[PDB]
């Protein structure tokens, strides 16, 4: 019963495991979390591409082989954060947990996946520049030190006009102001900014109405959103969790029935059945956590935030 090679990459690390015919998604995850030393697991998941090109999350409950993981030598997984909190500030408790979000969000912005205006960009870059190098000191940090650093989204490089140096000089100015800022805060401060971005935390899907117009259905922490195909930023129709009563689907048809019966029902169409199941999958997840975060803190969570207060407090 030969084992199946697997590669799981964290944000800043590569892990190589060996699975079997019937190793559940759970097992794999549980191990990755153990090997990485991550506790707040409810935020992550293993991501991958299916036989037919789409990205998606590994179902923990059904088996790893028993889902469309692209058939390639080491099965490729990305231990990447699945759900985003409503306020990065008081939901991400541990340094490590705080971390992987920072790095995950950074990449996304640098890859234009999460849009970002040039100013917000330069500021964000400055915070990372603070978190990587520490305090600006001129004696060591002379001009062009940010020469070899990836810092800004591409869209703000190609669509503008500064040289790389000028741009660098801006990050440079901001960098000077963030003095005496530990990397923990530098990182959190980054996220605080980023979470207010229009695209942050949104899962986009390709769909159509009944006519046949292209549309984007987004699933985020607060509910659903229907976007116009050319505007992935502004929702043309939002469906907060509390205004929806029940979400359902048949092969390619999806329906969003509003809690208000005087209101009509919404329906969009999905390319393949797999996408509708995946959309509903994410809706459970976020909603699930949307409630867990409006009820008292689990004891485990309590001692976490507690033990966390002592890890940044002081001494004598």
């Amino acid at each position: 019963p030969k084992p199946i090679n697997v590669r799981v990459t964290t944000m800043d690390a590569e892990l190589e495991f060996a699975i079997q015919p019937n190793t559940t998604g759970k097992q794999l995850f549980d191990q990755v979390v153990k090997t990485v030393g991550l506790r707040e697991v409810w935020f992550f998941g293993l991501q991958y591409v299916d036989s037919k090109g789409y990205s998606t999350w590994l179902k923990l409950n059904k088996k790893v082989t028993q889902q469309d993981v692209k058939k390639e030598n080491p099965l490729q997984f990305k231990f990447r954060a699945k759900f985003f909190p409503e306020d990065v500030s008081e939901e991400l408790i541990q340094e490590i947990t705080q971390r992987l979000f920072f790095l995950q969000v950074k990449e996304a912005i640098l890859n234009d996946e999460i849009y970002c205006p040039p100013e917000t960009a330069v500021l964000l870059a400055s915070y990372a520049v603070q978190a990587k190098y520490g305090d600006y000191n001129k004696e060591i940090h002379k001009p062009g030190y940010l020469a070899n650093d990836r810092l800004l989204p591409q869209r703000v490089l190609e669509q503008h006009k500064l040289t790389k140096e000028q741009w660098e000089e801006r990050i440079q100015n901001w960098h000077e102001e963030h003095r005496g800022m530990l990397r923990e805060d530098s990182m959190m401060e980054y996220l605080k900014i980023a979470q207010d971005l229009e695209m942050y935390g949104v899962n986009y899907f390709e769909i159509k109405n009944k006519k046949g117009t292209e549309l984007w259905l987004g699933v985020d922490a607060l509910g659903l959103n229907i976007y116009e195909h050319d505007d992935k930023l502004t929702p043309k129709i939002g469906f907060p969790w509390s205004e929806i009563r029940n979400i359902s689907f048949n092969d390619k048809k999806f329906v969003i029935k509003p809690i208000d019966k005087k209101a009509p029902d919404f329906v969009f169409y999905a390319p393949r059945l797999r996408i509708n199941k995946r959309i509903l999958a994410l809706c459970m997840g976020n909603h699930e956590l949307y409630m867990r975060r409006r009820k008292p803190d689990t004891i485990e969570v309590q001692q976490m935030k507690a033990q966390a207060r002592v890890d940044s407090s002081g001494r004598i």
Binding site: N246, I247, F249, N250, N276, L280
Partner: peptide, 15 residues
């Protein structure tokens, strides 16, 4: 095989 599916949210059930 597996074709259909739904999740009841606001339904006075989950609070």
């Amino acid at each position: 095989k597996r074709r259909t599916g739904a999740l009841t949210l606001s339904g006075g059930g989950k609070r």
